[PDB]
Design a protein around this nucleic acid. Sequence first.
DNA 1: ATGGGACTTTTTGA
DNA 2: TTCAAAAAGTCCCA
Length: 545
Amino acid sequence: GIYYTPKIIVDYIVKKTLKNHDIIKNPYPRILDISCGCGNFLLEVYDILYDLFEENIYELKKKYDENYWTVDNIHRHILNYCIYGADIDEKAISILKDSLTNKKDESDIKINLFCCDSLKKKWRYKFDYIVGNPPYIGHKKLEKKYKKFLLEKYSEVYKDKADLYFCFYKKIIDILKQGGIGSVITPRYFLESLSGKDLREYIKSNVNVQEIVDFLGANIFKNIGVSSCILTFDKKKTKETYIDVFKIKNEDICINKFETLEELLKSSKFEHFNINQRLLSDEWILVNKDDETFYNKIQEKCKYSLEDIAISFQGIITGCDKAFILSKDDVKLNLVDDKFLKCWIKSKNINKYIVDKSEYRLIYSNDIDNENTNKRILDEIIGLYKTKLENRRECKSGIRKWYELQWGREKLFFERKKIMYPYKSNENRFAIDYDNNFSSADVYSFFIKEEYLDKFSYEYLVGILNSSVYDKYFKITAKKMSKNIYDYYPNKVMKIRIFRDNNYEEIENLSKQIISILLNKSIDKGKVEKLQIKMDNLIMDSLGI
DNA sequence: ATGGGACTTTTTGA
DNA sequence: TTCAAAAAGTCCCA
Ligand SMILES: Nc1ncnc2c1ncn2[C@@H]1O[C@H](CSCCCCNCc2cccc(-c3ccc(Cl)cc3)c2)[C@@H](O)[C@H]1O
Ligand SMILES: [K+]
Ligand SMILES: [K+]
């Protein structure tokens, strides 16, 4: 329900928004945490504000009402005019209310804490500074009634498989004063994900993004499987609009290495570079100049993309794998006619250039005509999960029989020579499938269009796609998920661009040698690495890198 | 107990 | 009718 941001990050975000505030010019700054919780950020905002007022108390006393601006009145002034908080949890608000009160009855000091849905509250005024950590809820874990509200009221950033924190970005931007500064920590995925395209467009066209701190797959929150970034933006009048990008280099480092986050950012554990916000396309390609030069060379040289030459499709989605997937040595497969059985592989079975021998079998239950002819299969294998199967969406609507696969796709797409790759991996692993392998959605497949078979072969494609060049090339724009894991999904894999030049024959021949060695009984993996090194040199020569 | 590594389902909107 | 996206991942062990 409540997640605690590390103190080093909270202090960095508060200092990011307030360290250059001119309290003399504006002694009434409105600082808001829209998901304040117990007050991780607001309590630190109090301390920073208190030092700001006390350090200039005599200048304020001289410039303004001398009786009002006293050290004894700082506590009341902060709570009345400066600190604002909102959270849906009553108990967190009550705890934060006590913590703010205990920072110092005389007369009923009013604290601007609201217990509400920040996405529904009618905010009466805008704010100078906004900080905090919004909630993250995906499309599966969000209520259907609430999602209808979000789709209707937040359609500028929320669509399809978008996340809840997209709307908080929109709300924070909307209620930020002109010239104000916002700084939040959110998941990093919107920086590259397809769902975040509208959100990226909304941020780019409404605020100046001062800084992006990208932690990639490092674990910022303990015992939480999320990858985080810090976004700092303003609504100031500026003409340069360049972004400071801090991208981590070592994902295993501990965040408490230094007393402050800015020490870590300046260190060798991070890299810094600048991106012109006016040059951002629908995609935000945030890489240094060497990588940008590398990426642009490959883009310009290559004339084809995988989408042009290939047909992509996602694997089987049974809707209940335990009901339809069995070990190939399971005795219950004696009850199933071999015409119903398909080879079944997982992502771990995909290597470079080849697929491991399958150990599981899929019951393609869609080919079972009626319940009477194959009652034994239904009663003894599939029916053990009938209650769970009946709860699938297409079963409740009558589109699918209780024993059918939820998304059985087309058999002919799988029962052919094709290339398969895992949906999440640390490296490029594209394999030729010779054995008509089926898979779940953790493996993606594609086959070459007929009109392009004379230009590109499967052996050539796996040669370049598994090379170190294309491993680096794909990861420049790929979606970073967690420690040493990128998404390998068609929405980016099919955008990979490929080339064809005088090195085609030698590259294809080297790949065939690698494939031949990998399929032998006594595999000498040593020569495979040497052949791969030779191929990488050819590809680098081909692409002029 | 916590931190780190291998591995990855099916619900869901369109 | 039927596609493909989505980690506040999930789980195990030292
Ligand atoms: N709409 C909101 N408006 C304002 N504040 C808001 C709004 N949502 C959230 N918060 C605040 O964000 C603040 C910080 S982010 C964290 C909020 C995530 C809430 N979802 C996650 C979630 C959804 C469903 C069930 C559960 C759940 C229940 C019980 C158990 Cl054992 C385990 C899990 C959790 C928090 O203190 C929140 O009170
Ligand atoms: K005065
Ligand atoms: K992480």
